[PDB]
Paper text:
DEAD-box proteins are widely distributed in different life forms, ranging from bacteria to human and constitute the largest RNA helicase family. DDX41, a member of the DEAD-box proteins, containing a disordered N-terminal region, a DEAD domain and a Helicase domain, was identified as an intracellular DNA sensor in myeloid dendritic cells (mDCs) by Yong-Jun Liu’s group. They showed that DDX41 directly binds DNA and STING via its DEAD domain and triggers activation of signaling mediated by mitogen-activated protein kinases TBK1 and transcription factor IRF3, resulting IFN production.
The crystal used for data collection belonged to space group P21. The hDDX41 DEAD domain consists of an α/β fold, which is similar to those observed for other members of the DEAD-box proteins for which structures are available. The overall structure consists of ten α-helices (α1–α10) and a β-sheet formed by eight β-strands (β1–β8). In agreement with this prediction, results of the static light scattering analysis indicated that the DEAD domain exists as a monomer in solution. The DEAD domain protein can bind ADP and AMP but not ATP in vitro because of the steric hindrance.
Author numbering: 157 to 398
Write the structure that this text describes.
Amino acid sequence: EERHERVRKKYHILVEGDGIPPPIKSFKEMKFPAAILRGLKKKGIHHPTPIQIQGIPTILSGRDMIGIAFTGSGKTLVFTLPVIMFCLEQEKRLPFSKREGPYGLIICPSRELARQTHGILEYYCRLLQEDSSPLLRCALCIGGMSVKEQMETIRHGVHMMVATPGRLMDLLQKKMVSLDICRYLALDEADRMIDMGFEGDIRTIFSYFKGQRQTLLFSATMPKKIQNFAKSALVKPVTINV
Ligand SMILES: [Mg+2]
């Protein structure tokens, strides 16, 4: 409980909450498969950022998390890499069937953030496959794609979905996607999402979970409004600030 604070102070990591898992200074010690480690080098990513150092082990242990981190902090790997791992184990335990809804869900304010994060997921998923792991399937639920097209992407079952709140809500209400097996919900740029009026749509999306989920909220800012929303959204979260 003693050296971990030295790690944190050095990399300017502020944490709140109980039973915080130890920070980890290397991707290998976070027990990632080598195909992912190679993907990281191959993208020039040799060393974990502060948000990754404390964030990844927090997520891996199943804790809810509030991440106060900015665009460019490396936050995207914090919420993409662990769920890919989670999905990989589920698919190995029981291969996903044709319509089995998403296991992991990532909600973004905008179409372009959604595509970009979806793009990242498909990169790591592809490297796993090229190591003989099964294909994990990543779906986009954003505006500008038809209904037909949306149902096409998920006909094979979907492990991970990246959505904007409006389109996802509509699909849930129309029973075209289900959250019956969704165990992981990441909220990216939550501050922006609140500023844009998506609060209600997101609370509605919440009501489509039957039973526990791990929830993650990422926000560049933590004013009183985001703080109250986070308290209602998450369960005993570890708060991590860089
Ligand atoms: Mg961002």
